[PDB]
Design a protein around this ligand. Sequence first.
Ligand SMILES: [Zn+2]
Ligand SMILES: [Zn+2]
Lengths: 61, 1114, 48, 67, 45
Amino acid sequence: LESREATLNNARRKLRAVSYALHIPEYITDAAFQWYKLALANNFVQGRRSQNVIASCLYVA
Amino acid sequence: DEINTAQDKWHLLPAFLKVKGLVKQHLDSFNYFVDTDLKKIIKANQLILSDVDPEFYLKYVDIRVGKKSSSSTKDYLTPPHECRLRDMTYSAPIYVDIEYTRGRNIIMHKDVEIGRMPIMLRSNKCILYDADESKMAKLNECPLDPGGYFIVNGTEKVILVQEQLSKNRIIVEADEKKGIVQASVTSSTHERKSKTYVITKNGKIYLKHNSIAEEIPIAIVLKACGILSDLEIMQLVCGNDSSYQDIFAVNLEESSKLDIYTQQQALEYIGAKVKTMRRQKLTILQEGIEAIATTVIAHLTVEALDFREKALYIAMMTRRVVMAMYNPKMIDDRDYVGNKRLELAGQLISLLFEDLFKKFNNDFKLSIDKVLKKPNRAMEYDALLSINVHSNNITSGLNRAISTGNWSLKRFKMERAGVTHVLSRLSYISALGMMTRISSQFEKSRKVSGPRALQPSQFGMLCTADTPEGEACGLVKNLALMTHITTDDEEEPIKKLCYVLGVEDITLIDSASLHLNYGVYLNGTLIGSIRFPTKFVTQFRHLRRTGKVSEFISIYSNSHQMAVHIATDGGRICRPLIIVSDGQSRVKDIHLRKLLDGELDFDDFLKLGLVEYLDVNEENDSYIALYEKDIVPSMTHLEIEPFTILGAVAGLIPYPHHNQSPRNTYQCAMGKQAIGAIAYNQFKRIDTLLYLMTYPQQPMVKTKTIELIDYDKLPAGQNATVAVMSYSGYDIEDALVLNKSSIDRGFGRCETRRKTTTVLKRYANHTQDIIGGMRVDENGDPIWQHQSLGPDGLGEVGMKVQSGQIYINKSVPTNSADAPNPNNVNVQTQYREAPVIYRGPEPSHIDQVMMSVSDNDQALIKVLLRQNRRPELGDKFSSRHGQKGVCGIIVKQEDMPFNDQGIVPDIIMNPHGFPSRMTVGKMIELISGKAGVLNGTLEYGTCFGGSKLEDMSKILVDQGFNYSGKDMLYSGITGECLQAYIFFGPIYYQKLKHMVLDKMHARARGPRAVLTRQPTEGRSRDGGLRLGEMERDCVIAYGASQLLLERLMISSDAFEVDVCDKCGLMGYSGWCTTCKSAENIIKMTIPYAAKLLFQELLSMNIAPRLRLEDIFQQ
Amino acid sequence: DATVPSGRPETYIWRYLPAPPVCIRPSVMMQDSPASNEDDLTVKLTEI
Amino acid sequence: MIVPVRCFSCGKVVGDKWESYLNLLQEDELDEGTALSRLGLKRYCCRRMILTHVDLIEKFLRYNPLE
Amino acid sequence: TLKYICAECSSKLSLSRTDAVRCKDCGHRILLKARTKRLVQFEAR
Ligand SMILES: [Zn+2]
Ligand SMILES: [Zn+2]
């Protein structure tokens, strides 16, 4: 959906946001994007807070 | 050495360049930006505030670039040569201190990092500042490097020196058929980009502006400023007893038609015809909106209550436009040099900085009020925990603007591009000649030869004989040898200073006295209405030379109009010359001796009162002398040194004043293409495509210019023994002839070094790139492609490569974009090969290879290939006096002639150039060279002087040769004497670029374009040349009609199309697909570029129906 | 003129529009990404 | 770099004379024109091989990677 | 062997593969491949 595209393009900003803070090079940030991509599809993103579901996401990468 | 002030005024010109260099413009502009202007930006965007939580604030108190305040060390910083091998940005951190309200208490914190500032070399913030070639030996940088350029992400770039028309002044124009217009552009630093026009429609003056929808006659708008008595207006514009009153006589009645006649009605006439601001204030007055319409106009001057000086400033603007119609000679051109403001780099990067710095914090205030609208997170919340999220928006904004030289601003909305350029490292001076060059504005005056030509107001202002040709023919210009750029100081206290000198005030004078007297102009604006200016102006020079007022002020004083000018705007051209009071100068040779003692530098000459700066406008009033043997008792401002009129890339011509002037620009365009040394660290740097000469030599006839830039310390080109003559017919017009032996002894064996790079890249599925190599066969490692690939996959150092023969083996995972399955089930065989094959027609060597990391954790592979070559025929040589020349053949030594001693000349050129090219300089340099060798002394060839001829002929006639070098020598092919005499000596032949081993290419049958099936333009894309439209006309003028099709569709664009007879258009392999019959189909062949036209024109509603006949049965 | 089937003046404004082949508007693969820079014709025809 | 071993034109060797040209200037402060003519450079094609020769190999060797 | 050498540390070392990119004895991260022992051939003209 376009709303599905609009919420990831919103989230594309936010995982890139903390990568600037922690001096994260880009190949972690793009690699963690797929982990958020599947966890959105696997109905994990609903209910939890937005900043909590991305901070837990990129630590795995 | 009895020193005198006659010929030793030269010996302070090094004393200028020593303390005050040649990269004055880029050092002093950027270093002023670092100290002063950075405080001036945060004081303009202090005190960020939010509407929610109104008791919250954060304030910027100060700004420091470089060190911290705790450690108070210099810094710990990356070396620049270490930075340029890792493709990093040579930067320095930005540190501020901030005070804010955490909560119950307010709290001030120090040393907050925001971003990294890329800073130029040899500035006071870099570690190269004031080194002693021992730290710089440890930092392996060249001491002879000028500096003044950035090292953003690898490649080294430099910002050029821009210029535009003189902002914040008035300029007059003359147009034939659409009437005549006057323009005045103004731009203060707050939202202002406004230009004002004075149009003369059908004999009636009008004023149009880009905020007013209509044109307004001037008799309203000065009555709107309070001046309404309407006999003032005739007396201001015209004066008295002239033809101007009859010229103005039509303009007055437009006030009478609308019947305003008063100051009250004169405002709202304008504001009833303005379409601006869209009612931003919901409480309009409709009478107050013309006071601000009188405020956003003519932004030179502002007002408080009287509207006095802005009124007459329109009238002084209007006096020019009436005088324009009285005679068209009074209009001045916009290519006079005084109408040009040379605008530098450091005062231009500041315009991008404050635009981008306010884009930082307004995005930062959106990152706090999202939190401040929370009930639970409203007490313990801190702001600068999230300062780092916007930190990477000032680094990648600056590093993009410098890498891609197009600066997108918001407050002005203007999109100039190409403001930065890669500096060319072909020669030493090529990297120095690009430091002093000017890129213009290209104001779309392509029809007018005005800006293309050269104006006489340029002598010593900037260089004259170095300007490119071709497309860029006259819009690129170059600075002089002695040149300083002014800077503004202040206009406020000098306005207080002239009132001490006995000048009147603007709000007191009558209309009568101002045209009778003269008037001071402050930056184009009258303030004082001075009388008898000669007592006023000459005391002010005595105030300036004593040094109470700053020295960069000009007292340009014309006499066509009745006015004098005061200029303090800064950023305009000037050069210094020494003051002469009367028929005796202020030379004082004992001061010139006290300079050479070492305590009297060049700055003290202007402090004591013995030198002063003159712009282009002060050189109106001056009467510059040439020589001390040319002093008159009516003569001021002796000129310091007459050969300082040539640029540093033009200065290497020996004795130019004998040589022709069009043969100077041909050399100055080639001098940047001369091969020689580069730098001391040239065996350490890894640059893209970098040539060297093996055996360089300093030239025989030097110049005073080239010893100031230390060209002799690392020269370009070598001096060989020329015998100018015709020989074997292989040199007809300016070809060259040389011997096989001297190349075999090593005559200029150049050497080509070339970079190539690749990046190991990490994917999203956590896969790297591996360097597996040397697959083996039949008991041996090396395949024909693998004799120089080494154990680790990196090509082995010290051995050659040929076509094929992979030198770096790069293997890529085949799952380049597949999704990460969180498992490890089958990952063992996925690396497909993607190597880089060494192409090229000649065997080259591997010099060395290094590997390192970038700014992110990501590996690099950079090998520098190496090859040298011998100067075989085809290679373009030069002569340093503007003679292009290509090697015709290569003779042996037996065929060459020889003198009585048996000296064999090196290069042959025919005598048939010197009458046409009028190059007298080579005819006298060869005399100046030969006598110096036998005396063992190097001779100076300067402009406007140097060593003479008659003292030089005395030297070699004592050695026993001919008295003007015109020797005689036997023939090598037959033995006997030659009937004429020869001309002989050593001349300095420097090799150029454009060698022929990397220009020969041929495309027999190769790749085709995907859209046109045509050969691919570009030699690196395998070529295939364009038989253009102009050659297609020349074929049919022969009347040949059979190769015309063969060269345009057979060998190029043959394509076979089946077309149907009825309903004629094409179909695929065997069909018609609009009458599906597969029957009436005829096979022919057409151009593919005509076939796709029968699809592209068929895409819109036009149907090219074809109609067919047979050839036979006429 | 008449006597052609296409002689009506009805056919001089767009009611149907054809799509050209992809050979004249080929998908240029610039190899700056795993995705293609898709050309101007298709990205105008898409929102039509 | 280093001095060319032969002359460009005639081709007698000058490789033993660069150090002797320097040694004839530290001691025995002398004119450069009479110095090498004493050494035996009669041909002026040979004389320009040492006058013009800037010796950059001293300035290059201070950038050695071996410390 | 005579593997990778550093720029200014100039210390001969043999890096084991896919492990590090820095050198020992210094934190400097630019290192050169040394010249091989293998014979190479040239001419003299
Ligand atoms: Zn048909
Ligand atoms: Zn080390």
